């Protein structure tokens, strides 16, 4: 089955460049154009350009023909997008997607989230939220960039940015007989700092 696998989220400083990748599988790489699009949160899609891996020709939106460079490597069936001279406004989700019948876009990569900021990469501080069904939670504070994953042993809220640090929380609802007799632990991963936290939900006093 067709699949486009994009590279992970990256944080980059303003002024620098970055290159993201889109590894294609399950079809003849050179037989189809791949397009690249930008989507800022809450907004629709903006087209950057496309790559034709058959002849290595790429075609650009006039707006991006300076900033963006699309390439591909036939041997690894990977397409690449380089964005240069990065600024805040380049922060967005970027998608690769395959060109199909009548230039419909039939298979999409999962998206690569780019964050452009001067802010320091910072691992989270994780705090237990302790008081028939009982709600527990954990507060994941003071981290940058996104994302964090939260796993228990459920409502996990989108992060909020303030003064270049994110705050996120997650709530879990178990029965009274479970906690505190059993261990309950929220497991936080922050891949950008290569950190995790195994926080035990401890009762107070």
């Amino acid at each position: 089955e067709v699949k486009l696998e994009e590279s992970g989220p990256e944080l980059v400083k303003p002024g620098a460049s970055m290159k993201m990748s889109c590894k294609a599988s399950g079809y003849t790489f050179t037989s189809y154009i791949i397009h690249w699009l930008k989507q800022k949160p809450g907004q629709g899609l903006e087209w950057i350009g496309y790559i034709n891996p058959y002849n290595d020709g790429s075609k650009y939106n006039e707006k991006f023909k300076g900033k963006a460079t699309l390439t591909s490597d036939k041997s690894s069936s990977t397409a690449y997008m380089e964005l240069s001279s990065l600024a805040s406004e380049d922060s967005a989700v970027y998608y690769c997607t395959r060109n199909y019948g009548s230039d419909s876009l039939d298979y999409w990569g999962q998206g690569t989230t780019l964050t452009v900021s001067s802010a320091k990469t910072t691992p989270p501080s994780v705090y237990p939220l302790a008081p028939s069904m009982v709600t527990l939670g954990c507060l994941v504070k003071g981290y940058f960039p996104e994302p964090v994953t939260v796993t228990w042993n459920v409502h996990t809220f989108p992060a909020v940015l303030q003064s270049d640090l994110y705050t996120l929380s997650s709530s879990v609802t178990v029965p009274s007989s479970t906690w505190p007799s059993e261990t309950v632990t929220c497991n936080v991963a922050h891949p950008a700092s290569s950190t995790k936290v195994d926080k035990k939900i401890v009762p107070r006093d």
Partner: protein, 214 residues
């Protein structure tokens, strides 16, 4: 860059309701090169309808698409919860291909009151000089809700971060988290912390408190 204007920008529908949404172009576009996508939060768009009226693989037959020239529409014969998403139109009559700013289709459902829980600062957090009080407001509908924080009965507006989930896939409710952050010094100078939710489901606020005496 042909402008595509989608209407309505936002709309709600109950299970079973017929839904139609429109995409208007500033220039004529061939129907063969007009397509629709569905996108859910945190995930990639999927092709939904291609060449005006052909359903993409796996798209249920309650969807249909129509149009020509400058006026296109997507129709949902009977709304189901899995259909809540943003739908985007796409023209590739000219380069650069362009897309609409989307119709966000939400699920309407019966009102539901929030379940409210309040949590004091952990001693771990206090050890480092910070103090965050957290309030969860879980599984309520409609989205409109006013959380107020009170310290010894007096309203606090500064230092509050609020975050809403997207509609839940199963029950179509919203949840919300509210985090009041103070200094340890400020926190330790008051006794009671109160989270108050006003929501159309109760004439009274749903209130939770704790005091630094328990």
């Amino acid at each position: 860059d042909i402008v595509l204007t989608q209407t309505p920008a936002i709309m709600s529908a109950s299970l079973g309701e017929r839904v139609t949404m429109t995409c208007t172009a500033n220039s004529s576009v061939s129907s063969n090169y007009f397509h629709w996508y569905q996108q859910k939060p945190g995930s990639s768009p999927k092709l939904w309808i291609y060449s005006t009226s052909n359903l993409a693989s796996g798209v249920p037959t309650r969807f249909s698409g129509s149009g020509s020239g400058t006026s296109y529409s997507l129709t949902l014969s009977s709304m189901e919860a899995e259909d809540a998403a943003t739908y985007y139109c796409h023209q590739y009559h000219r380069s650069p291909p362009t897309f609409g700013s989307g119709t966000k289709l939400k699920m309407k459902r019966a009102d539901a009151a929030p379940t409210v829980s309040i949590f004091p600062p952990s001693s771990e957090q206090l050890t480092s000089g910070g103090a965050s009080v957290v309030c969860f407001l879980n599984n309520f509908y409609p989205k409109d809700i006013n959380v107020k924080w009170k310290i010894d009965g007096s309203e606090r507006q500064n230092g509050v971060l609020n975050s809403w989930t997207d509609q839940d896939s199963k029950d179509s409710t919203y949840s919300m988290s509210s985090t009041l952050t103070l200094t340890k010094d400020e926190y330790e100078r008051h006794n009671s912390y109160t989270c108050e939710a006003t929501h159309k489901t109760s004439t009274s606020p749903i209130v939770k408190s704790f005091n630094r005496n328990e």
